[PDB]
Short mmCIF file of C-alpha atoms and ligand atoms in Angstrom, two decimals:
data_model
loop_
_atom_site.label_atom_id
_atom_site.label_comp_id
_atom_site.label_asym_id
_atom_site.label_seq_id
_atom_site.Cartn_x
_atom_site.Cartn_y
_atom_site.Cartn_z
CA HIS A 1 -14.19 2.71 10.19
CA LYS A 2 -10.55 3.97 10.79
CA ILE A 3 -9.28 7.36 10.47
CA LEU A 4 -7.02 6.41 7.62
CA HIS A 5 -10.25 4.97 6.36
CA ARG A 6 -12.31 7.67 6.15
CA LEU A 7 -9.62 10.12 5.01
CA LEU A 8 -8.96 7.76 1.76
CA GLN A 9 -12.47 7.04 1.69
CA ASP A 10 -13.17 10.79 1.04
CA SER B 1 -5.42 -1.20 -15.07
CA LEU B 2 -4.63 2.27 -16.40
CA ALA B 3 -1.82 2.13 -14.84
CA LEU B 4 0.14 -0.30 -16.41
CA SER B 5 -0.45 1.46 -19.50
CA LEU B 6 1.26 4.74 -18.70
CA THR B 7 4.98 4.96 -20.40
CA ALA B 8 8.19 5.91 -18.52
CA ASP B 9 7.61 9.96 -19.05
CA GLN B 10 4.16 9.47 -18.08
CA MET B 11 5.04 7.83 -14.74
CA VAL B 12 7.86 10.16 -13.58
CA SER B 13 5.20 13.14 -14.39
CA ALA B 14 2.57 11.50 -12.91
CA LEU B 15 4.13 10.79 -9.42
CA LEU B 16 6.29 14.46 -9.58
CA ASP B 17 3.01 16.03 -10.07
CA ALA B 18 1.49 14.14 -7.13
CA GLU B 19 4.60 15.27 -4.91
CA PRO B 20 3.26 16.47 -1.81
CA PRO B 21 4.00 19.98 -0.30
CA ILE B 22 6.96 20.97 2.27
CA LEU B 23 5.27 22.00 5.37
CA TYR B 24 6.25 24.11 8.35
CA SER B 25 6.77 23.61 12.11
CA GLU B 26 5.09 24.81 14.71
CA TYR B 27 9.14 25.54 15.69
CA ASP B 28 8.83 28.90 18.56
CA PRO B 29 12.29 29.99 18.08
CA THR B 30 12.21 31.57 21.39
CA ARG B 31 11.18 28.47 23.32
CA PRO B 32 13.68 26.43 25.33
CA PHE B 33 13.67 22.95 24.03
CA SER B 34 12.79 20.21 26.21
CA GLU B 35 12.32 16.20 25.34
CA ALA B 36 8.61 16.82 25.67
CA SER B 37 8.64 19.86 23.22
CA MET B 38 10.76 18.70 20.28
CA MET B 39 8.58 15.36 20.46
CA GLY B 40 5.77 17.41 20.33
CA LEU B 41 6.86 19.76 17.19
CA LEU B 42 7.87 16.07 15.51
CA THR B 43 5.02 14.79 16.27
CA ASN B 44 2.66 17.54 14.93
CA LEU B 45 4.39 17.73 11.90
CA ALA B 46 4.09 14.37 11.25
CA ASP B 47 0.10 14.66 11.76
CA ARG B 48 -0.09 17.35 9.50
CA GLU B 49 2.36 15.20 6.95
CA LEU B 50 -0.10 11.97 7.06
CA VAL B 51 -2.54 14.20 5.45
CA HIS B 52 -1.22 14.92 2.39
CA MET B 53 0.64 12.04 1.97
CA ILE B 54 -2.75 9.71 2.30
CA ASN B 55 -3.97 12.55 -0.86
CA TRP B 56 -0.49 11.83 -2.72
CA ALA B 57 -1.09 7.89 -2.42
CA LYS B 58 -4.48 8.23 -4.03
CA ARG B 59 -2.16 9.44 -7.29
CA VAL B 60 0.56 7.14 -6.91
CA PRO B 61 -0.41 5.00 -10.33
CA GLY B 62 -1.99 1.48 -9.71
CA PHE B 63 -3.09 2.68 -5.95
CA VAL B 64 -6.43 3.19 -6.14
CA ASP B 65 -7.09 0.36 -8.23
CA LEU B 66 -6.65 -1.62 -4.90
CA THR B 67 -9.26 -2.69 -2.35
CA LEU B 68 -10.30 0.10 0.34
CA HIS B 69 -9.10 -2.37 3.10
CA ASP B 70 -5.61 -3.09 0.95
CA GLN B 71 -4.85 0.93 0.53
CA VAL B 72 -5.28 1.07 4.23
CA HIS B 73 -2.86 -1.38 5.24
CA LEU B 74 -0.19 -0.30 2.71
CA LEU B 75 -0.22 3.01 4.16
CA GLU B 76 0.13 1.54 8.16
CA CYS B 77 3.16 -0.41 6.95
CA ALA B 78 4.75 2.77 5.38
CA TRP B 79 3.67 5.48 6.53
CA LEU B 80 6.89 5.98 8.77
CA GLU B 81 9.70 5.23 6.14
CA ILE B 82 7.58 7.46 3.68
CA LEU B 83 7.90 10.55 5.84
CA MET B 84 11.71 9.22 6.68
CA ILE B 85 12.53 8.74 3.22
CA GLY B 86 10.92 12.13 2.75
CA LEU B 87 13.31 13.82 5.69
CA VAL B 88 16.48 12.06 3.79
CA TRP B 89 15.34 13.59 0.88
CA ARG B 90 15.16 17.03 2.06
CA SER B 91 18.28 16.71 3.90
CA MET B 92 20.71 16.01 0.94
CA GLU B 93 22.39 19.12 0.46
CA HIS B 94 22.23 20.00 4.38
CA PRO B 95 24.77 17.84 5.92
CA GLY B 96 25.13 16.63 9.47
CA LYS B 97 21.43 18.54 9.52
CA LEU B 98 18.23 17.32 9.08
CA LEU B 99 15.19 19.42 7.75
CA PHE B 100 12.44 18.22 9.25
CA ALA B 101 10.52 21.53 8.38
CA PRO B 102 12.08 24.63 6.39
CA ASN B 103 12.48 26.35 9.80
CA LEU B 104 12.75 23.12 12.00
CA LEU B 105 16.61 22.12 10.83
CA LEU B 106 18.41 19.73 13.44
CA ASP B 107 21.94 18.37 13.93
CA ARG B 108 22.57 15.14 16.34
CA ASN B 109 23.40 17.09 19.22
CA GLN B 110 19.56 18.43 19.33
CA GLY B 111 18.21 14.95 18.87
CA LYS B 112 20.03 14.13 22.20
CA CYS B 113 17.44 16.14 23.50
CA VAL B 114 15.05 13.30 23.56
CA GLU B 115 16.26 9.76 25.09
CA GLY B 116 17.01 7.10 22.80
CA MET B 117 16.14 9.23 19.33
CA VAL B 118 19.97 10.18 18.63
CA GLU B 119 20.82 6.93 17.25
CA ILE B 120 17.99 7.47 14.69
CA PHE B 121 19.34 10.67 13.48
CA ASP B 122 22.88 9.21 13.59
CA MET B 123 20.93 6.60 11.11
CA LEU B 124 18.71 9.13 8.71
CA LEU B 125 21.91 11.18 8.66
CA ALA B 126 24.21 8.58 7.19
CA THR B 127 21.23 7.93 5.02
CA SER B 128 21.21 11.62 3.87
CA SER B 129 25.32 10.94 3.31
CA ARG B 130 24.14 8.05 1.30
CA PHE B 131 22.08 9.72 -0.82
CA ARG B 132 24.03 12.85 -1.58
CA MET B 133 27.43 10.69 -2.32
CA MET B 134 24.92 8.78 -4.72
CA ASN B 135 23.84 12.15 -6.30
CA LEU B 136 20.35 10.91 -5.82
CA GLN B 137 17.59 12.75 -8.46
CA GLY B 138 14.45 13.66 -7.51
CA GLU B 139 12.98 11.89 -10.28
CA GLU B 140 14.48 8.33 -8.84
CA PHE B 141 13.23 9.48 -4.97
CA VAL B 142 9.89 9.59 -6.21
CA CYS B 143 10.25 6.29 -7.76
CA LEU B 144 11.56 4.83 -4.49
CA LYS B 145 8.95 6.58 -2.20
CA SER B 146 6.48 4.73 -4.53
CA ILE B 147 8.07 1.59 -4.02
CA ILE B 148 8.16 1.83 -0.12
CA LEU B 149 4.31 2.47 -0.49
CA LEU B 150 3.83 -0.56 -2.82
CA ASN B 151 6.06 -2.92 -1.42
CA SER B 152 6.38 -2.41 2.43
CA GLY B 153 3.44 -4.33 3.34
CA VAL B 154 2.62 -6.34 0.10
CA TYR B 155 3.44 -9.48 2.11
CA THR B 156 1.71 -8.89 5.31
CA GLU B 157 -4.58 -12.58 -5.88
CA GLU B 158 -4.99 -9.36 -7.32
CA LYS B 159 -1.20 -8.31 -5.34
CA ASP B 160 -0.25 -9.88 -8.74
CA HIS B 161 -1.18 -5.84 -9.73
CA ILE B 162 0.99 -4.31 -7.28
CA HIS B 163 3.67 -6.58 -8.52
CA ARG B 164 2.89 -5.48 -11.99
CA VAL B 165 2.86 -1.89 -10.85
CA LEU B 166 6.12 -2.66 -9.25
CA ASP B 167 8.20 -3.67 -12.49
CA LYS B 168 6.43 -0.63 -14.30
CA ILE B 169 8.53 1.71 -11.43
CA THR B 170 11.70 -0.56 -12.35
CA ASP B 171 11.29 -0.10 -15.56
CA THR B 172 11.13 3.79 -14.74
CA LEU B 173 13.99 3.56 -13.00
CA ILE B 174 15.99 2.29 -15.82
CA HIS B 175 14.32 4.17 -18.50
CA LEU B 176 15.62 6.93 -16.32
CA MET B 177 19.59 5.88 -15.82
CA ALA B 178 19.44 5.05 -19.46
CA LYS B 179 18.57 8.78 -20.39
CA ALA B 180 21.33 9.73 -17.97
CA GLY B 181 24.06 8.26 -20.24
CA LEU B 182 24.71 5.47 -18.09
CA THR B 183 25.92 1.92 -19.20
CA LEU B 184 23.84 -1.07 -19.13
CA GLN B 185 25.90 -2.27 -16.48
CA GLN B 186 25.95 1.15 -14.37
CA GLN B 187 22.17 1.09 -14.79
CA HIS B 188 21.52 -2.33 -13.21
CA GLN B 189 24.05 -1.41 -10.27
CA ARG B 190 22.56 2.10 -9.53
CA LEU B 191 19.19 0.55 -9.48
CA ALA B 192 20.94 -2.51 -6.97
CA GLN B 193 22.32 0.48 -5.20
CA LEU B 194 19.06 2.53 -4.63
CA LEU B 195 16.89 -0.37 -3.79
CA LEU B 196 19.30 -1.57 -0.81
CA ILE B 197 18.59 1.24 0.67
CA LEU B 198 15.30 0.44 1.08
CA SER B 199 16.32 -1.64 2.93
CA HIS B 200 17.78 0.45 5.58
CA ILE B 201 15.29 2.68 5.54
CA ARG B 202 12.66 -0.37 6.80
CA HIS B 203 15.61 -0.40 9.75
CA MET B 204 14.65 2.92 10.85
CA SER B 205 11.07 2.81 10.36
CA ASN B 206 11.30 -0.29 13.25
CA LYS B 207 13.81 1.76 14.99
CA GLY B 208 11.13 4.63 14.74
CA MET B 209 8.20 3.13 15.50
CA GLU B 210 9.26 1.48 18.70
CA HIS B 211 10.65 4.66 20.09
CA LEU B 212 7.23 6.57 19.10
CA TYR B 213 6.04 4.00 20.95
CA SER B 214 8.09 4.31 24.25
CA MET B 215 7.21 7.98 24.10
CA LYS B 216 3.24 7.36 23.86
CA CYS B 217 3.78 5.05 27.01
CA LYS B 218 5.95 7.38 28.95
CA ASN B 219 3.21 9.31 28.09
CA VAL B 220 5.63 12.46 27.47
CA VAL B 221 4.33 13.92 23.88
CA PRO B 222 0.03 14.25 23.11
CA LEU B 223 -0.06 12.13 20.19
CA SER B 224 -2.64 13.00 17.85
CA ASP B 225 -5.60 10.47 16.95
CA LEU B 226 -4.34 9.59 13.56
CA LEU B 227 -0.80 8.85 14.71
CA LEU B 228 -2.08 6.73 17.48
CA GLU B 229 -4.03 4.49 15.27
CA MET B 230 -1.19 4.34 12.66
CA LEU B 231 1.13 3.20 15.47
CA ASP B 232 -1.29 0.69 17.21
CA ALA B 233 -1.03 -0.53 13.27
CA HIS B 234 2.06 -2.49 14.38
CA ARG B 235 0.94 -4.27 16.85
CA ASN C 1 44.04 -3.88 -3.82
CA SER C 2 41.08 -7.04 -3.49
CA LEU C 3 40.99 -10.33 -4.96
CA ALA C 4 37.41 -9.94 -5.17
CA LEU C 5 37.07 -7.13 -7.91
CA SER C 6 38.72 -9.46 -10.27
CA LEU C 7 36.84 -12.41 -10.68
CA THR C 8 34.35 -13.42 -13.01
CA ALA C 9 30.75 -13.93 -12.60
CA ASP C 10 31.02 -17.77 -13.06
CA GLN C 11 33.92 -17.47 -10.38
CA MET C 12 32.18 -15.49 -8.07
CA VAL C 13 28.99 -18.06 -7.97
CA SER C 14 31.19 -20.74 -8.01
CA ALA C 15 32.85 -18.99 -4.69
CA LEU C 16 29.53 -18.35 -3.14
CA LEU C 17 28.46 -22.20 -3.60
CA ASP C 18 31.65 -23.99 -2.20
CA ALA C 19 30.72 -21.26 0.91
CA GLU C 20 27.48 -22.27 1.37
CA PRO C 21 27.27 -23.70 5.26
CA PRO C 22 26.08 -27.42 6.36
CA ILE C 23 22.39 -27.98 7.15
CA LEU C 24 22.47 -28.98 10.89
CA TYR C 25 20.15 -31.15 12.25
CA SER C 26 17.75 -30.69 15.65
CA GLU C 27 17.69 -32.81 18.79
CA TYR C 28 16.14 -36.54 18.07
CA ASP C 29 14.01 -36.36 20.68
CA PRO C 30 10.15 -37.30 19.53
CA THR C 31 8.38 -35.89 22.40
CA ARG C 32 5.47 -33.59 21.15
CA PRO C 33 4.10 -31.63 21.66
CA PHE C 34 6.48 -28.61 22.07
CA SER C 35 6.45 -26.62 25.46
CA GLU C 36 7.50 -22.91 25.03
CA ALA C 37 10.20 -23.37 26.89
CA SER C 38 10.97 -26.84 24.38
CA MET C 39 10.50 -24.87 21.09
CA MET C 40 12.53 -22.08 22.14
CA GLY C 41 15.01 -24.46 23.79
CA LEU C 42 15.76 -25.89 19.84
CA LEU C 43 15.06 -22.82 18.34
CA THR C 44 18.18 -21.11 19.76
CA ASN C 45 20.42 -24.35 20.16
CA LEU C 46 20.17 -24.49 16.49
CA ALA C 47 20.51 -20.98 15.77
CA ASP C 48 23.51 -20.85 18.03
CA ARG C 49 25.29 -23.89 16.30
CA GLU C 50 24.58 -22.01 12.91
CA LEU C 51 26.79 -19.01 13.92
CA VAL C 52 29.29 -21.07 14.33
CA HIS C 53 29.24 -22.07 10.52
CA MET C 54 27.90 -18.28 9.63
CA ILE C 55 31.65 -16.97 10.48
CA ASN C 56 33.16 -19.59 8.22
CA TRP C 57 30.73 -18.99 5.07
CA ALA C 58 31.39 -14.86 6.05
CA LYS C 59 35.22 -15.40 5.66
CA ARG C 60 34.93 -16.86 1.99
CA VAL C 61 32.49 -14.46 0.68
CA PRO C 62 34.35 -12.46 -1.75
CA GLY C 63 35.86 -9.24 -0.40
CA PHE C 64 35.23 -10.10 3.14
CA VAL C 65 38.40 -11.22 4.33
CA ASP C 66 39.80 -7.62 3.08
CA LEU C 67 38.04 -6.16 5.60
CA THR C 68 39.38 -4.99 9.09
CA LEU C 69 37.98 -6.96 12.45
CA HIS C 70 35.61 -4.40 13.36
CA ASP C 71 34.14 -3.96 10.21
CA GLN C 72 33.54 -7.41 9.91
CA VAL C 73 32.45 -7.91 13.54
CA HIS C 74 29.50 -4.68 12.70
CA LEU C 75 28.54 -6.60 9.28
CA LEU C 76 27.76 -9.77 10.87
CA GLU C 77 26.43 -8.62 14.78
CA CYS C 78 24.34 -6.22 12.65
CA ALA C 79 22.83 -9.06 9.97
CA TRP C 80 23.17 -12.35 11.54
CA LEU C 81 19.36 -12.92 12.37
CA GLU C 82 18.60 -11.84 8.88
CA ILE C 83 21.18 -14.72 7.34
CA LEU C 84 19.27 -17.22 9.52
CA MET C 85 16.37 -16.34 8.45
CA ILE C 86 16.99 -16.10 4.55
CA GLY C 87 18.83 -19.52 4.80
CA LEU C 88 15.52 -20.82 6.75
CA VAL C 89 13.26 -19.36 4.22
CA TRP C 90 15.43 -20.99 1.54
CA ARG C 91 15.25 -24.29 3.07
CA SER C 92 11.71 -24.26 3.22
CA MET C 93 10.76 -23.32 -0.21
CA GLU C 94 10.17 -26.94 -1.14
CA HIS C 95 7.95 -27.18 1.60
CA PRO C 96 4.70 -24.79 1.43
CA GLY C 97 3.18 -24.01 4.34
CA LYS C 98 6.36 -25.27 6.63
CA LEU C 99 9.23 -24.32 7.96
CA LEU C 100 12.21 -25.85 7.84
CA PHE C 101 14.53 -25.18 10.84
CA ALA C 102 16.09 -28.54 9.98
CA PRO C 103 15.44 -32.02 8.36
CA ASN C 104 14.03 -33.42 11.38
CA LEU C 105 12.51 -29.66 12.64
CA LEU C 106 9.54 -28.95 10.11
CA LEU C 107 7.29 -26.66 11.96
CA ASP C 108 4.10 -25.17 10.84
CA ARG C 109 2.47 -21.77 11.68
CA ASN C 110 0.23 -23.66 14.22
CA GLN C 111 3.59 -25.38 16.21
CA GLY C 112 4.58 -21.37 15.93
CA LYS C 113 1.41 -20.89 18.30
CA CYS C 114 3.63 -22.88 20.89
CA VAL C 115 5.52 -19.74 21.56
CA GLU C 116 3.75 -16.66 22.29
CA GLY C 117 4.17 -14.01 19.88
CA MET C 118 6.23 -16.10 17.32
CA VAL C 119 3.13 -17.14 15.46
CA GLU C 120 2.80 -13.93 13.42
CA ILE C 121 6.60 -14.41 12.69
CA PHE C 122 6.10 -17.47 11.37
CA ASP C 123 3.81 -15.96 8.96
CA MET C 124 6.26 -13.48 7.71
CA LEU C 125 8.88 -16.42 7.13
CA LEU C 126 6.20 -18.62 5.36
CA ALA C 127 5.09 -15.86 3.25
CA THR C 128 8.72 -15.17 2.38
CA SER C 129 9.12 -18.43 1.35
CA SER C 130 6.23 -18.54 -0.72
CA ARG C 131 7.08 -15.72 -2.49
CA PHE C 132 10.83 -17.59 -3.21
CA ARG C 133 9.05 -20.51 -4.56
CA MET C 134 6.61 -18.38 -6.62
CA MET C 135 9.62 -16.81 -8.05
CA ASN C 136 11.44 -20.21 -8.67
CA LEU C 137 14.24 -18.73 -6.58
CA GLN C 138 17.65 -20.80 -8.16
CA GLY C 139 20.30 -21.85 -5.50
CA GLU C 140 22.75 -19.87 -7.58
CA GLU C 141 21.00 -16.37 -7.01
CA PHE C 142 19.92 -17.55 -3.64
CA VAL C 143 23.82 -17.28 -2.62
CA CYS C 144 24.20 -14.07 -4.30
CA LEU C 145 21.34 -12.46 -2.14
CA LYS C 146 22.46 -13.59 1.66
CA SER C 147 25.88 -12.61 1.00
CA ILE C 148 24.31 -8.87 -0.41
CA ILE C 149 22.84 -9.01 3.21
CA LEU C 150 26.29 -9.78 5.06
CA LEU C 151 27.84 -6.67 3.25
CA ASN C 152 24.84 -4.17 2.98
CA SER C 153 23.03 -4.22 6.46
CA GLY C 154 25.39 -2.52 8.27
CA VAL C 155 27.11 -0.67 5.84
CA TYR C 156 25.25 2.52 6.49
CA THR C 157 26.24 2.43 10.37
CA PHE C 158 30.03 2.92 10.09
CA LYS C 159 32.71 1.26 2.81
CA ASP C 160 34.16 2.11 -0.90
CA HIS C 161 35.48 -1.19 -0.92
CA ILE C 162 32.17 -2.85 0.20
CA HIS C 163 30.20 -1.00 -2.59
CA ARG C 164 32.13 -1.90 -5.11
CA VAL C 165 31.68 -5.79 -3.96
CA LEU C 166 28.13 -5.38 -3.70
CA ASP C 167 28.39 -4.02 -7.34
CA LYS C 168 30.14 -7.33 -8.28
CA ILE C 169 27.70 -9.13 -6.67
CA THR C 170 25.29 -7.08 -8.68
CA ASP C 171 26.95 -8.11 -12.22
CA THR C 172 26.49 -11.54 -10.91
CA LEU C 173 23.31 -11.83 -10.41
CA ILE C 174 22.11 -10.28 -13.56
CA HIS C 175 24.25 -12.53 -16.03
CA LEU C 176 22.91 -15.53 -13.78
CA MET C 177 19.40 -13.70 -14.86
CA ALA C 178 20.79 -13.12 -18.67
CA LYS C 179 22.14 -16.75 -18.26
CA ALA C 180 19.01 -18.41 -17.51
CA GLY C 181 17.48 -16.53 -21.16
CA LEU C 182 15.63 -13.76 -19.71
CA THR C 183 15.23 -10.26 -21.59
CA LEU C 184 16.97 -7.30 -20.59
CA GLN C 185 13.88 -6.19 -18.91
CA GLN C 186 13.02 -9.19 -17.11
CA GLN C 187 16.56 -9.10 -15.71
CA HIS C 188 16.35 -5.87 -14.04
CA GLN C 189 12.42 -6.53 -13.15
CA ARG C 190 13.70 -9.79 -11.38
CA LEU C 191 16.60 -7.66 -9.68
CA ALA C 192 13.97 -5.28 -8.09
CA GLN C 193 11.87 -8.27 -6.94
CA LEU C 194 14.56 -9.94 -5.40
CA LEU C 195 16.22 -6.89 -3.50
CA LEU C 196 12.81 -5.59 -2.25
CA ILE C 197 12.92 -8.94 -0.62
CA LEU C 198 15.47 -8.09 1.53
CA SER C 199 13.51 -5.12 3.10
CA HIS C 200 11.05 -7.77 4.05
CA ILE C 201 13.96 -10.14 5.25
CA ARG C 202 14.88 -7.11 7.17
CA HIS C 203 11.57 -6.45 9.12
CA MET C 204 11.40 -9.92 10.26
CA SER C 205 14.48 -10.02 11.35
CA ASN C 206 13.85 -6.63 13.82
CA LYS C 207 10.58 -8.51 14.81
CA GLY C 208 12.41 -11.57 15.91
CA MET C 209 15.09 -9.61 17.51
CA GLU C 210 12.43 -8.12 19.59
CA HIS C 211 10.64 -11.79 20.28
CA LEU C 212 13.87 -13.10 21.09
CA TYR C 213 15.09 -10.04 23.23
CA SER C 214 11.81 -11.02 25.30
CA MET C 215 12.55 -14.24 25.90
CA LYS C 216 15.84 -13.61 27.45
CA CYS C 217 13.91 -11.03 29.74
CA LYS C 218 11.26 -13.44 30.52
CA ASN C 219 14.07 -15.74 31.46
CA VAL C 220 11.78 -18.38 28.70
CA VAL C 221 15.10 -19.77 27.55
CA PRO C 222 19.02 -20.33 28.46
CA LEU C 223 20.70 -18.22 25.31
CA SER C 224 24.08 -18.86 24.86
CA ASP C 225 26.68 -16.30 25.55
CA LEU C 226 27.68 -15.76 21.64
CA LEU C 227 23.79 -15.80 21.35
CA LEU C 228 23.47 -13.08 24.09
CA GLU C 229 26.41 -10.86 22.42
CA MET C 230 25.13 -10.85 18.96
CA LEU C 231 21.49 -10.03 20.61
CA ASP C 232 23.33 -7.31 22.88
CA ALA C 233 24.68 -5.82 19.65
CA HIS C 234 21.44 -4.45 18.86
CA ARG C 235 20.43 -2.67 22.12
CA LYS D 1 37.22 -13.44 26.04
CA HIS D 2 36.41 -9.76 24.76
CA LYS D 3 33.98 -10.79 22.26
CA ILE D 4 33.34 -14.82 21.53
CA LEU D 5 32.56 -13.00 17.73
CA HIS D 6 36.34 -11.96 18.30
CA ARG D 7 37.59 -15.71 18.56
CA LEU D 8 35.40 -17.07 16.20
CA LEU D 9 36.43 -14.91 12.89
CA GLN D 10 40.01 -15.49 13.85
CA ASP D 11 39.96 -18.76 14.29
CA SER D 12 37.72 -19.19 11.17
CA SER D 13 38.44 -22.27 9.02
C1 LIG E 301 9.77 8.41 14.70
C2 LIG E 301 10.11 9.80 15.39
C3 LIG E 301 9.09 10.96 15.75
C4 LIG E 301 8.83 11.30 13.81
C5 LIG E 301 10.01 11.87 12.94
C6 LIG E 301 9.44 12.73 11.71
C7 LIG E 301 8.96 13.51 11.73
C8 LIG E 301 7.94 13.90 10.22
C9 LIG E 301 8.82 13.82 9.37
O1 LIG E 301 8.73 14.20 8.44
C10 LIG E 301 9.66 12.69 9.76
C11 LIG E 301 10.09 12.01 10.71
C12 LIG E 301 11.16 10.97 12.97
C13 LIG E 301 11.48 10.56 14.51
C14 LIG E 301 12.34 9.37 15.27
C15 LIG E 301 12.36 9.42 16.36
C16 LIG E 301 10.28 9.74 16.64
O2 LIG E 301 9.79 8.61 16.97
C1 LIG E 302 14.42 -15.63 16.33
C2 LIG E 302 13.37 -16.64 16.99
C3 LIG E 302 15.15 -17.82 17.19
C4 LIG E 302 15.86 -17.98 16.31
C5 LIG E 302 14.89 -18.84 14.72
C6 LIG E 302 15.86 -19.43 13.78
C7 LIG E 302 15.49 -18.99 12.42
C8 LIG E 302 16.55 -19.49 11.73
C9 LIG E 302 17.45 -20.62 11.77
O1 LIG E 302 18.13 -20.81 11.06
C10 LIG E 302 17.46 -21.04 13.12
C11 LIG E 302 16.55 -20.42 14.23
C12 LIG E 302 14.15 -17.66 14.31
C13 LIG E 302 13.05 -17.21 15.78
C14 LIG E 302 11.95 -16.50 15.90
C15 LIG E 302 11.61 -15.99 16.58
C16 LIG E 302 12.75 -16.90 17.93
O2 LIG E 302 12.72 -15.77 18.96
#
């Protein structure tokens, strides 16, 4: 997953 | 959706409370400027701001109602626009100066340190001059930045909800201007003036994205992993 | 000192409608399929001929005649591709999934693959045209939007006179929506919806400008001296 | 000469 994806998922 | 149930005053309060903090640069005043060090300062700042922007976006009413894929796409398209409107807002009361950070205030002459950046500095400074000539208010600014987030990638089923929230923000803007004593004619006129700025904000972001892509290919500035992914999303 | 400010809303509409340029045709050769050189030739030949009629249209836009030659040049150099693209999108509105470059040049997204890197631009143009169709965009609203692009896109790269004319066009857009029976809330919501699309049109022009620049550098297509100069204004 | 756009605007009909 993209970095943005993980940060949005937190 | 719970965002659609908000009045205008609740929308402003929610947007104002979500506001990200103003970060400081790593600017070492003793260090003489090079093209690499100034681009290094700007991109390091942008990388740290992106973390706060992501968590700001989650607090923008309606944004979390979108699928995770849709949130990724919106921020990928609008991240530099959002950073730039923030810069322009910070710089409003600093004529001829861009306040990237409280300790990083640059004029167009210092932008010449980076090849091709002075043309972008001039466009940001002119946008800042336009905000100052309009006496843009903080409540109007937070609406505009949320509009960019929801609008910039909306055209690249449940988009009806995005447009529904976008209309709620239009409602909020008119509400603010009505509360400011503007006539009906003046409200629509100011609304139009504010939204046409976003066309210019798209332009500078397009130009700034190409410039950032040139510094990456030249191996001038070590770009962070997040910033590289946000940059590759425009190709 | 400008005659444009004394115009009523109906007079503004009539002036813009009478200013509309003609719909030009492409060459009639039925040889299919197109090559990349053939299609880019058709598209640039058409754009070149449309540019001559655009100059005539711009001189008929209320307030444009009152500007100096240099200011007129600046606005046109800045907005020329945006102006061709909103006209293209307008012409294609009744043709879902297709782009009516001309009455004898109606292309789909698969024909956009005939030119390298244009299918992305085709898709954006198609999404814009579908957005206009779903909004039931009226011809009176269209001429106001195209004139706004002309006056606004280059206004922050130079203004008081221009901003007063833009305000006049906003009053005209609102008046048209009131005349159609929209409530006050529906009026400003629709005004915002249309003006936000101009941010997308700017994006499509910037992408199209870089694509046209690559075609010249790659010597795919002979570009007219006029096109080369309009392209050179964007550096 | 200078700019084709100059002649087009000056000769606009
Ligand atoms: C985009 C850019 C790096 C990031 C800069 C920037 C950084 C932080 C910020 O809040 C706004 C803007 C603007 C520069 C202009 C040219 C350069 O490529
Ligand atoms: C800019 C471009 C050539 C002109 C095209 C065009 C668009 C509108 C129009 O009325 C005529 C021509 C749009 C193309 C998109 C890519 C290509 O380079």
